[PDB]
Ligand binder design. Structure first.
Ligand SMILES: O=C(O)CCC(=O)C(=O)O
Ligand SMILES: [Fe+3]
Ligand SMILES: [Zn+2]
Length: 427
């Protein structure tokens, strides 16, 4: 009863100096704290939350696109079937698109009408640095490990944009607005700040229980990884799964630790901003690679290209944690062997490989057909200036085989071997 309703790890920062303490990093990344709420963070850091107010956003970019989710308004601990007799797991929302100005008007008018179907403004893109300069500069006041960009954040070594992960997303909400259950892409940590003026209610389960939650989704007819679902709490309690529940008030920052399963509902009218962080720790990296592998089994795109990222961190960051070092070193070796096996079988087949190289800000490539990361050896076809990249398997599966397929190598064996050899444990 007490164990199934654990208290939520909470922190108040008395000053700006408290927020920059290494103890804060330690507490938030601790595998025992699946979720942390930092009360009054905006205040303690003198963050100008007014820069993300609905009025300021409309002024900044009122015609900016907003993905709208249309939903039935219901209590945060309920999700009813269509007949209204039964709780169900699937949480269905109509997708559509509007502008910030239009959602703003609905948000403002909704609020006055107070002084049942709703609309939730979701995944609003704040990536354009010029369009959102004062907003993004404000987030430089955060301690390094929570910033959008940082040397200790894996997402800062991708070398290019991953929308919604290493760029900020905005959510504009009215009461009842729901974000259904998920783990973050590749189990990365998440940062969320409530601009407010209202509250959000959060629900969270520790990473350890994710397979049981996955089994419920399958039992209840919805895809765990990609589907839209809202847990029935009695089902979780009956399975002895502790559920963290709390309110995030305006100015509160929520830190969602690696792999934490979470879902959220607005209690009032508010805006939230969010992004991902990948702290360079053994715990984060292991969870990120586990999901990377599981994603492949389930044919779900890994939005973080973990092989590309591992090479990049290997080239530029000094790793002192020996557990993390061993994990990365292994991944790198496995990557070199995979590339070697491909080159050898292509040479035995009599197929030429052109050296292409890498250019600045180049994306990581994925297979057109199956969405796996395609690292280094690229199987390229010409669709109709339209080049498509394929993995080895999908290329071989073509009816004419590798005829008409151009094979490109982005890193020579020696480039990889030399980066690998220079990757050593820092003291
Ligand atoms: O505020 C929201 O609805 C998004 C919550 C979330 O999933 C996150 O910040 O990771
Ligand atoms: Fe999330
Ligand atoms: Zn493929």
């Amino acid at each position: 009863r007490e164990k199934l309703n654990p208290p939520t790890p909470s922190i108040y920062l008395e000053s700006k100096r408290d927020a920059f303490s290494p103890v804060l990093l330690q507490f938030c990344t601790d595998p025992r704290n699946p979720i942390t709420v930092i009360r009054g963070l905006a205040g303690s850091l003198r963050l100008n939350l007014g820069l993300f107010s609905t009025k300021t956003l409309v002024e900044a970019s009122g015609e900016h696109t907003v993905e709208v989710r249309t939903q039935v308004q219901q209590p945060s601990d309920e999700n009813w079937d269509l007949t209204g007799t039964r709780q169900i797991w699937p949480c269905e929302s109509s997708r559509s698109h509007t502008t910030i100005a239009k959602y703003a008007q609905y948000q403002a008018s909704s609020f006055q009408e107070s002084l049942h179907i709703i609309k939730f403004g979701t995944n609003i893109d704040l990536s354009d640095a010029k369009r959102w300069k004062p907003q993004l500069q404000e987030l430089l006041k955060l301690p390094a490990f929570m910033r959008v960009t940082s040397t200790g954040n894996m997402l800062s070594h991708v070398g290019h944009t991953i929308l919604g992960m290493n760029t900020v997303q905005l959510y504009m909400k009215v009461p009842g607005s729901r974000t259904p259950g998920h783990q973050e892409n590749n189990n990365f940590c998440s940062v969320n700040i409530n601009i407010g003026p209202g509250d959000c209610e959060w629900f969270a389960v520790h990473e350890h229980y994710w397979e049981t939650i996955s089994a419920f989704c399958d039992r209840h007819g919805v895809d765990y990884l990609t589907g839209s679902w809202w847990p029935i709490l009695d089902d979780l309690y009956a399975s002895n799964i502790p559920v963290y529940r709390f309110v995030q008030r305006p100015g509160d920052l929520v830190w969602i630790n690696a792999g934490t399963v979470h879902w959220v509902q607005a209690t009032g009218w508010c805006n939230n901003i969010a992004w991902n962080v990948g702290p360079l720790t053994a715990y984060q990296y292991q969870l990120a690679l586990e999901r990377y592998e599981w994603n492949e089994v389930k044919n779900v795109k890994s939005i973080v290209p973990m092989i590309h990222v591992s090479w990049n961190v290997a080239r530029t960051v000094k790793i002192s944690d020996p557990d993390l070092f061993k994990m990365i070193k292994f991944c790198l070796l496995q990557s070199m062997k995979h590339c070697q096996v491909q080159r050898e079988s292509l040479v035995r087949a009599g197929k030429k490989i052109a050296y292409q190289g890498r250019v600045k800000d180049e994306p990581a490539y994925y297979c057109n057909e199956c969405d796996v990361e395609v690292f280094n050896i690229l199987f390229v076809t010409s669709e109709n200036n339209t080049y498509l990249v394929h993995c080895e398997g999908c290329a071989r599966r073509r009816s004419a085989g590798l005829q008409g397929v151009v094979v490109l190598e982005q890193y020579r064996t020696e480039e990889l071997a030399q980066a690998y050899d220079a990757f050593t444990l820092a003291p």
